[PDB]
Ligand binder design. Structure first.
Ligand SMILES: NC(=O)c1ccc[n+]([C@@H]2O[C@H](COP(=O)([O-])OP(=O)(O)OC[C@H]3O[C@@H](n4cnc5c(N)ncnc54)[C@H](O)[C@@H]3O)[C@@H](O)[C@H]2O)c1
Ligand SMILES: NC(=O)c1ccc[n+]([C@@H]2O[C@H](COP(=O)([O-])OP(=O)(O)OC[C@H]3O[C@@H](n4cnc5c(N)ncnc54)[C@H](O)[C@@H]3O)[C@@H](O)[C@H]2O)c1
Ligand SMILES: NC(=O)c1ccc[n+]([C@@H]2O[C@H](COP(=O)([O-])OP(=O)(O)OC[C@H]3O[C@@H](n4cnc5c(N)ncnc54)[C@H](O)[C@@H]3O)[C@@H](O)[C@H]2O)c1
Ligand SMILES: NC(=O)c1ccc[n+]([C@@H]2O[C@H](COP(=O)([O-])OP(=O)(O)OC[C@H]3O[C@@H](n4cnc5c(N)ncnc54)[C@H](O)[C@@H]3O)[C@@H](O)[C@H]2O)c1
Lengths: 339, 339, 339, 339
């Protein structure tokens, strides 16, 4: 059956999700929208040729009984209250990251979801759906390189907007690695530490440190070293290397474009857009959500608990940024509801 | 505006198309099927949970006024007659390759289609939709390596089934390159020549020469050298290199799997399945066709004329296979209907 | 013994050999030079800090009894007469390829050398000494990919000098591949065919066809397809791929330079000359020559016979250049003197 | 004329240097040896066919006035005294790393050499002479990626012998990076910290932690992250990546062995031996030293000052190894004598 969707927040990512659901993926229809900028919501209806109702707020949209699921794609800070409202309904919930902007708000959502008769929240941590990353995890899990000892990763971005802040290096950028690594390793974190190498001359934003180095430790003792570099200029790139007892695994270079021989060099193109980089993952993640809703089954993607783990770890990281000191992490055991 | 499809031939590729149309792609629905093996048609309905009618034959399916387009996915030798029948209707037509198993058959098709007020046939030459191959063409077309002088290509397959004949090295295998190269180069063929290097010990099929070397010449003078190697053992691989005046372009290695460092080697996996290799292309190809039907606009993919060029070239190659001599190709000028 | 060397021809490769003999290799001193351009000769003595006589011609240099060995590093068309004159002395002779530019010339050299009491000529077929090419051969010879069915090779140069003729595409360039493949495969040729693809707009030399395609067949039925492209612009490159029954072997990309990520690309430098690409091979071959001379023993590297065998195939190709037709080859057995 | 060399310590590396000087490189002769294992010394003369004197000790060797330069290749702990003895002569001195096993020792050497009229000591830090590493440095120095912000490196070794200690991870392994980085960056170290991820199950040696992570900071703020992994199993590998403001540079794939396509994989061999990995660099290093001596000019390779920087940094790392805490480094400004 067709999954009828309401979308809350019709900005860049909201419109991208509307486009997915309407023009790319199978089995869904967007039938309602809302945005605090009402004109943006109307524009989304026009631009995507939707047979949709425009509601003036989330509360109103959420009382539409025809909606099967909502996508929450507003400002991060607005996710918590909207998700909590939606939990008073029967509707399935896809929220973009973050689940909430504080670990307390995340706990609030978890606590409330726990009272329900089924899990209904999926969180937009798309990395887990990327075919390359998944393939590396799968190979790791065969045991072929033994136990993972060290993980080295990079999150490379060409430049940022004038409103990108130091804390966003964590909450908008590193958050992807924060969710990814515990999943990749099937392990839990014990600490995080953010350090600041020399400041790049390319930074244009007051207060923003770039690059930043993140070191995470896990219970089994695997150490993760992530380089975050958001004014790198050259491209957008995600790199991942796992060092094992008996071997190594790494992601191959991204891209399908040709190898060019020209002008005394051999070269391949580098993606400039995070959008194009993860297009597959976004499509896969959403398709899976829709596929679950269609069966009235709980989502199988990243959950509220995953959202909580990320929010705890982000908070620790933002703390670490103040003085570059290691911050401990100790998250509670995973509820059965969430295993 | 859902495009209602009937499928003629519900074998391996028929089912794969149904699956695409039903479960992966957007905007279509399979509402009718037929197969000379009636039990197979019924199973396709059951298997994909279709709301569809099973027809005794193609003629009867084609009388269904609710069908907007047919997919022709029967044995190759049956394509011609079915396509001709379908052209007595107003429906759009997607036929898998070949357009016809003889060039005269292909011409009968083109001649008949030319009598219509608009073009309705797309032929399933999916190479044109593979992202890697397209990306290469695109880069070529920027002029960055100058004019293409030589193309070197490989079509590598690990092993073949007992039904695989010498002529199939052309009709099943090289056919993809035969369609591809004229498109890549925006050119027309003038000759083809097949030569036989030493016979591989891995050949278990009567009459089969393997490997085979195909040399094609074009009007602008580009020489195309394709290695066809169908008992190669190691994997399935499609390679493409364009030699230009001022540089070269080549396809990168296919695959997203990790790089493994282990046991004194660095390695990546090689695909063993052509099916897997071209998933994307099949999806893109079909989604385009569906998208054009949804607008009641002619297909923009490979056409009946392309099918014709393929058939003529394939015939010439089969002729060359007899004595390893060069066979001339003189393709008629493209009718404006097909421009 | 320190081997006292004279060099005839002090252009690009003459200088390079003087450099290696003086500054890198052991057991040699350049004590005399000549070039038809006296200024070039003088420049070599100066630039390499030699204590060397500058002779007005080859004949005078050859009559200096203090010289132990001569290097012939002139224009290829000049090697024949110089080598024949040197055979009138008891000096050891290292000649760059080709041995001669005609079959008749190479045969004269062999006929004269055969009258001597001991073998004294080494020909500069350096490919045989290149560690990478040797490594490939060794792997091939283990049987890991089965029998070699097809060889694909490229010989790419960025540009040529004004004295480079169509005929030199064979005698100066393809000659390397002519020698190499016989050695690689331990097989002999039965035919060669040269074809002319689309003429490059980058050609600046009257009468030169570029690129050229060479097809060589062996007794065992291996087919070799060589691309010769001497106005390629982008760089200098040698490529080698061996297609076997059960796998393939390929020479890797040569390069020491770093991988640069910059400006939406990932790139590595390509060599622009032979002089650095094959420095190891040249060093190895020349050191081996010197080491034999020091012992007054015959060279063990490629001989005048190897040069003659190559010249036969080369002459066949020069014949093929005229009409693009296949020319047969059947070389004589190796004389005892040369075994 | 020939540089006459004495060798003190005729063990594995001493013999290998003798081989370099005798068989591989040009312009030197080993005329004297000494070892505390007087039979070792005797073996070297014999096995390499030296016309050399066996001296009963280093003091006696150094009194031989016909010796131009000495190679100090004894146990590391024995370098300091032998070096200071040799500084009571006028001889040139090549000492393998370390200059000394204590930072106090290295300081004594520095202090004595600075009394002398000219520099005579070179220390065997061969990384600087590796072609790839050198090419990367030079590219970095063009400014093409802007200022270096972070360096990421790996020193990967497959297994270690029984005698390999925790401290040797620094003194024998990381020491190469310790020398390399400040030279690469033209900067000075301000701190080092050694951390221990989970212990690999492959470790068989008491007290050895493996892997180890080393973090170094420099005066300009560059952060260097080195992974040291000596029980890695898969191979010997040196990796290096420089993260700049506007791009990145990294070492290319190493190796000249063939690419093998076989059994559903594409693979290349990995070096298993550091010995083979750095053959070129050792040759280059020693040839330069000899070339300098030959013209009676001071060495231009790594100096005693470099040896002292290494000793200090190694000491700080050994200190850090105790508690995983950061240890500051404050290196005195370079004496004018050492530039
Ligand atoms: N997972 C990913 O990789 C990924 C990437 C991009 C964005 N995101 C998530 O996107 C959400 C959307 O980001 P964006 O880039 O689209 O930003 P945006 O600014 O473009 O859009 C948000 C849109 O938010 C609407 N809005 C704000 N508050 C609202 C509220 N309380 N109720 C309803 N609408 C509200 C804003 O008016 C607007 O139209 C964030 O949580 C962002 O982090 C995730
Ligand atoms: N483009 C590609 O890469 C690609 C790949 C695979 C197949 N194909 C095309 O597939 C067609 C299908 O191949 P396949 O692999 O599915 O083979 P198949 O043997 O599995 O299936 C064909 C199915 O054909 C049915 N059939 C035969 N004649 C029929 C007829 N006259 N009317 C209705 N049904 C008929 C057969 O009974 C069967 O169920 C061919 O043209 C094949 O070349 C193209
Ligand atoms: N084996 C290799 O990889 C390799 C590479 C480059 C060149 N070569 C061989 O180089 C020879 C030299 O080529 P090059 O690149 O140095 O070219 P070049 O043009 O740079 O130099 C040849 C030099 O030849 C001198 N010369 C010409 N005729 C002479 C004669 N009769 N007697 C004495 N000197 C004469 C020319 O004046 C000149 O100084 C050829 O045989 C070339 O094929 C081999
Ligand atoms: N730079 C490199 O990469 C590299 C590599 C290997 C070794 N090294 C340096 O090698 C020195 C030699 O190492 P090795 O592997 O050959 O060790 P080794 O144990 O094999 O050899 C040293 C030889 O030292 C002789 N010897 C010891 N003390 C002596 C003394 N006081 N006077 C004279 N001879 C003495 C030993 O008896 C023996 O004959 C060390 O400093 C080692 O670190 C450097």
């Amino acid at each position: 059956m067709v999954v009828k969707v309401g979308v809350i927040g019709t900005g860049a990512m909201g419109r991208a999700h509307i486009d997915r659901l309407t023009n790319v993926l199978t089995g869904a229809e967007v039938v309602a929208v809302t945005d605090i900028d009402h004109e943006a919501a109307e524009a989304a209806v026009r631009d995507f040729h939707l047979n949709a109702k425009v509601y003036p707020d989330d509360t109103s949209l959420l009382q539409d009984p025809d909606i099967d699921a909502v996508f929450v794609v507003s400002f991060g800070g607005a996710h918590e209250a909207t998700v909590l409202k939606a939990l008073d309904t029967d509707k399935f919930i896809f929220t973009e990251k973050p689940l909430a902007t504080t670990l307390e708000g995340a706990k609030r959502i978890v606590d409330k979801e726990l009272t329900k008769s089924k899990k209904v929240i999926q969180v937009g941590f798309m990395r887990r759906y990327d075919q390359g990353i998944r393939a590396l995890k799968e190979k790791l899990d065969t045991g072929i390189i033994g136990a993972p000892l060290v993980v080295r990763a990079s999150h490379i971005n060409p430049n940022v907007a004038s409103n990108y802040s130091n804390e966003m290096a964590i909450t908008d950028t590193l958050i992807h690695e924060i969710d990814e690594m515990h999943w990749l390793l099937d392990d839990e974190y014990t600490s995080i530490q953010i350090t600041y190498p020399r400041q790049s001359a390319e930074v244009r934003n007051e207060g923003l440190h770039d690059p930043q180095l993140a070191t995470l430790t896990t219970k089994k003792g695997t150490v993760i070293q992530v380089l975050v570099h958001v004014t790198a200029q050259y491209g957008y790139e995600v790199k991942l290397e796992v060092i094992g007892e008996t071997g190594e695994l790494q992601l191959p270079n991204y891209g399908l474009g040709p190898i060019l021989r020209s002008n005394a060099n051999q070269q391949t193109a580098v993606e400039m857009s995070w959008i194009n980089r993860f297009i597959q993952a976004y499509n896969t993640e959403v398709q899976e959500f829709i596929d679950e809703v269609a069966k009235s089954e709980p989502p199988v993607g990243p959950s509220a608990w995953d959202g909580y783990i990320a929010a705890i770890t982000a908070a620790a990281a933002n703390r670490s940024q103040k003085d570059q000191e290691t911050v401990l992490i100790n998250v509670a055991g995973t509820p059965t509801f969430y295993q």
